[model samples]
Target chain A: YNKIVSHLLVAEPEKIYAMPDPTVPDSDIKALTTLCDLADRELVVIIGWAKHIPGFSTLSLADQMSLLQSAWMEILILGVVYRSLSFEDELVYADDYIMDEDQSKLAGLLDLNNAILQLVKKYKSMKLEKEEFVTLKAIALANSDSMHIEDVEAVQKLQDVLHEALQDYEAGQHMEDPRRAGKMLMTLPLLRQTSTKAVQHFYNIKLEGKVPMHKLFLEMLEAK
Target chain B: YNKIVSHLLVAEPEKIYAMPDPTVPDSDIKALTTLCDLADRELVVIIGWAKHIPGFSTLSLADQMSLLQSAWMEILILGVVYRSLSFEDELVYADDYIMDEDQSKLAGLLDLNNAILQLVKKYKSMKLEKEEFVTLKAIALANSDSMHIEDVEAVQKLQDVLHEALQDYEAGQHMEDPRRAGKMLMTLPLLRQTSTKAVQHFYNIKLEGKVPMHKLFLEMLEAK
Candidate 1:
């Protein structure tokens, strides 16, 4: 209830401070790039590109940061799906990282495959393209909340543009039904849930000390 | 990741017992009939009816009970949406509890309405019916976990019947698009996410002492 009241806020709080966590570490690029974990490195790159979306920077700094934090994992996973699809790896991750279901379990990334399978099935059925995929990457990155947001409407306006683009793309591609826009966006909330569970899986991996990540990758996940 | 390994299990463990917690006093006919709580009391009756699904009772008692424990809030919420549709109770509850959305929040089921809206939009677009709701309820309940299930395949077989039945139901209803079946079924995982969230919202309500559920609803959401 209080959240709803806050959702209706018209005035900004004065003298804001730094946003919470998941801060980007631009200074240590060379050190962070040392390990070059492809997924982790590309994660930064994808997010960097998302930051350039027209009007994305107009939102309060916190709004932009929160959207990035909430959305980065979904974008990263979307990237992985496209990469594997291009290489035609039915059940593999990166090349040489070809692991069976059992090996994925051994890697402590439990719950990873089913969601991936879900996304794969949906994408294969629809025959998704690069343009739509990039548009969706932006759509998935938009956080629909106003917790620390100074200009929720402005941020929402930016999200609206991408949402319209996605709808238009789906309309042109699917042609059979305009509802396909919602269907494609539907995969995203599912991905968000999957990404939440995947966090737990990867946390378990961290505890198990298997399949290490780039130092920056861990920072990206942190609220510490 | 650990969850995936459980999926790989073959041998069954013996010595079955009760499914788990969340047993409300079905015995308190008078007291429960007295409306100790409308939501809690009705929750029991809804499942009391759901239990009679044709083959539901034929499954292992553990299987049947697990499904009930796993699926009531969702069913009740679904029921509320249908009852309130376009009476346009822009706000309301179980069959004729037509209050305002403002009132629903005041009643302390915060965050419940948005999810209800989601189901409403999906339900409206599909034009759902009572038969389909019950069957879909059954379909959503029939998870493929091997936890305490006595005969996973038997349960799966039971589930498959409903699955095909649902497909048939959709086939007859939405003669135009064959994909409608998968599209409708896809809403379940999304419902599951909403159900999990409602648990937390209701739990917080109980903790704030703003609202009271039967002792059982709390247990149903155990691991607090």
Candidate 2:
């Protein structure tokens, strides 16, 4: 279990933005394009990593992709929040670029940015740990909407195993705090809330022709 | 074990940058001032968090402050990097503001920024997890220079325990990744390297009259 997650825990490298010049003027289109490009690269990695997660392979191929396609945004959002826990106010878009209220305003992603900021603020206050983060990643990955799952029993059992792992993990701690797991688990709903905005943001931008969407991203979104 | 860390895992809030308006033109002084102000506030929180770390408070008052004062930069840098695991190329200064290689060049703190970026890049490649992050935080905090400690044995014992905990953590997993712990531990030196730059950056900036130093920050620096 730890092996699988620890392998997954290694950080992902940033795909250098295509922008060669740092002094190039910033614009709404540039920002949105950059965001989607990054998202496309990240999605490719997530798909690969998801395969190695225990029991994910046993599912019907359809189930595996379905789970990932449905929850990709949330998982990535969680990754971003986990990654940005140190920054008090901004969402990390890439290594060289970041998004905050003002920058998001300039990019015309105010709603998505604000929602992510709120989520980051929530996690920041909780002081998320690396252990919980990997567990949460697993949990989120396995936690696809049940209605969309074909073999509900198999998926549910996998989720059960993950939940047990998370519970055991929290129980192994010597601290007196009871709310730790609950509060951490609570962030899932908040994750979903923020993910909703991300979906809306991507859809609007895609339609407005401000950015090109990856075929995979379009398929993932359509899968939902 | 989990409870103590889970307690520590909750995120810290941003001490709202006192910049009343976001529109103010950024200057070299403003940038450095913002960095120090945020650092001062983060230091206060680190001081409080240090006491809660298991076995940390058992040391003498001098040792406690000594450990903190000596390793504060590294721990904070680790915190920043941990906070910034999601960011590939930039360091998160605050939620609203981020620093990158170019920004660092502009601030005249290119060396410090570059060193920190290299460290971040290393960890980002490693895909640091939250569990390893907290353990590393404990390790870095306890890892003050032996020459400075009055009761070296106690600190050493604590560090041994932390190392054991980390080893056990990696060992508990049933994976084939032998390099995980070794690679993660290797970052400590990289941490020290970056911390040295941080110290240098602060000193030059403090002497250059670019930013006001917090009394605590000065005391911390002098302790070394």
Candidate 3:
């Protein structure tokens, strides 16, 4: 847990960058297009951070990339949620690109927007901490989908390691609520569900040509 | 298209039989349990009707079953939406049992409830007709997941046939809106998305011991 915690802490981005104001003021499609580009930026950050996760680099290179490909959306969504915790009523996609319900509705991403709100509410109630968020994000990235993974044993081993790290950390921090870790872990399945929904949402946006998907985004999405 | 239409109309259940009023009054668990049972009964009806679908029986038995298993949730949801069109406010699971938002919330199925409502609103706007409903349902059942299916070619062929039937029917009935058929077809993907969500919904309910899934439901769900 110590090694895992230290590695994750160091890998965490020093700061979140902002999306500059769009060229055309108050354009929903422009806002959405900028959000898509922000997502691509975060995805690259996630790739770098994932490489630092304990035991991640030790896996077969194919498995490492495959795990990232399969789980980028979940991790990205988690990162989005973690950043939004600063504001009570708005989601902070970037420093200057926060969205409320009306903005999300205008941008044609109300579903994703509402889902993020739901998570925000729940995470707020849980009073989620940075350690918990990063650990959870690691678990998301280590998605042990055996069918897609080349070395099931290696991946499973990594999952067990992270699972224990989360358990030990939760026990040390919130001793009063023994069920907190279990409850927190349960969110991963829903996170995955929301991630799938986000994939389809973005795919539709790309199909409509409302936003241009980065090559990396398309590659990971295609692999998924 | 006429042959397909005639076969489907004849194969359609003469009427939806009601879920007999539950023994316990106003019990959320009991209501969900009864709903699960109702789903089982409908599965039996769907299987019998599927056998009667034109070109369905010509495919290998394995493929026929596979198609049904893969697409059962989508077909079930479409059927549920089709039935709800008769009543404006509530969703009718059977003659006796109806669910509104409150009921769905109490039953721990608010997600599925809201999705059904969303579909109902959209379908109402489109003024979907019975022929279109049946054709769309057929298209849902003819889902070609290729990976799990034995006869991909045959499944794809059946899909093509159903596709044309829908086009022909929509053209004849709603000539004013040339995109009516295309708009209707777009719902299929969302239906499939909702179906996947339902599978997880039901799986959670079953896991909680709140409802006992029927043997057939278990088989098809596990196969999925």
How does model 2 score on DockQ?
0.01
Candidate whose DockQ is highest: 1
Which pairs of residues collide in candidate 1? Answer: A110-B1
Error of 2 at B203 (Å): 58
Which docking category, incorrect, acceptable, medium or high, applies to candidate 3?
Answer: incorrect
Give the worst 10-residue stretch by lDDT in candidate 1 chain B. B4-13
Could you give the candidate ranking by lDDT, starting with the highest? 3, 2, 1
* Residues B45-158, model 1: lDDT tens digits: 655565555577787777777766766666656556665556553644533344556655654444566666666765775677655665666665664222345665676566
State the C-alpha lDDT per candidate. Answer: 0.54, 0.69, 0.74
Candidate 1 residue-wise lDDT, A1-224, digit = tens: 12211221221112212121245442223212222265566565665575567678666777777777666667667765654554332444454444345544544333566566556655765577666666667666763332345665676567566665665566566777545555465455456666666655555555655445666577656622
In the range B49-124, model 2's lDDT, one tens digit per residue, is 7877778888899889878876888877887787666886787766677787788887787877766776676677
